[PDB]
C-alpha cells in the first residue's frame, strides 16, 4: 500500500506518533517519506547483510526477525515481514520502542538527513486531522 499524506497523518495520530517522545506528526510523515516514500512494502538491503521493512524502514539487525540477518536481534517481537503490512500498527508500535531506546528519531538517516531542523510541520499541512 502506498499512502497519501494526509492519510498516512491520519493512521499515524490515530496511533498515538503525535508528539511520541516529543516528536511532532510532521517528523514521522516527513521521516515515512523519505525512507519509504509512504510505500509499506518498501524494502532495502544494508551493507552489513540486514534489510531494512516497511514505511518506516525497520532494520532487521535489532528490530525484526526475517530468518536471514545472523546474530543479529528481533527487539520488537516480529517477523519483518509483519511490517510490510498495509496496517500501519506494527510498524509504530515498533517505532515507538525505537524512538526511545534514547537516541530518539536519529536512528532514522533520512530523517536526520532531510527532516531534521527543517519545517516537518509542512507535512501534515492542508490535512484534516
Ligand atoms: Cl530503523
Given at each position: ?12 495520530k ?11 506528526l510532521?517528523?514521522?510523515?516527513c ?11 518498501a ?22 526477525n526475517?530468518?536471514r ?6 527487539l ?44 516537518v ?7 484534516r486531522?
Amino acid at each position: 500500500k502506498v499512502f497519501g499524506r494526509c492519510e498516512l497523518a491520519a493512521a499515524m495520530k490515530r496511533h498515538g506518533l503525535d508528539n511520541y517522545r516529543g516528536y511532532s506528526l510532521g517528523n514521522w510523515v516527513c521521516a515515512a517519506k523519505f525512507e519509504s516514500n509512504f510505500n509499506t512494502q518498501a524494502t532495502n538491503r544494508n551493507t552489513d547483510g540486514s534489510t531494512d521493512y516497511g514505511i518506516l524502514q525497520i532494520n532487521s539487525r535489532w528490530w525484526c526477525n526475517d530468518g536471514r540477518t545472523p546474530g543479529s536481534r528481533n527487539l520488537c517481537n516480529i517477523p519483518c515481514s509483519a511490517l510490510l503490512s498495509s496496517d500501519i500498527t506494527a510498524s509504530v508500535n515498533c517505532a515507538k520502542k525505537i524512538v526511545s531506546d534514547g537516541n530518539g528519531m536519529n536512528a532514522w538517516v533520512a530523517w536526520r538527513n532531510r527532516c531534521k531542523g527543517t519545517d516537518v510541520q509542512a507535512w501534515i499541512r492542508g490535512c484534516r486531522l
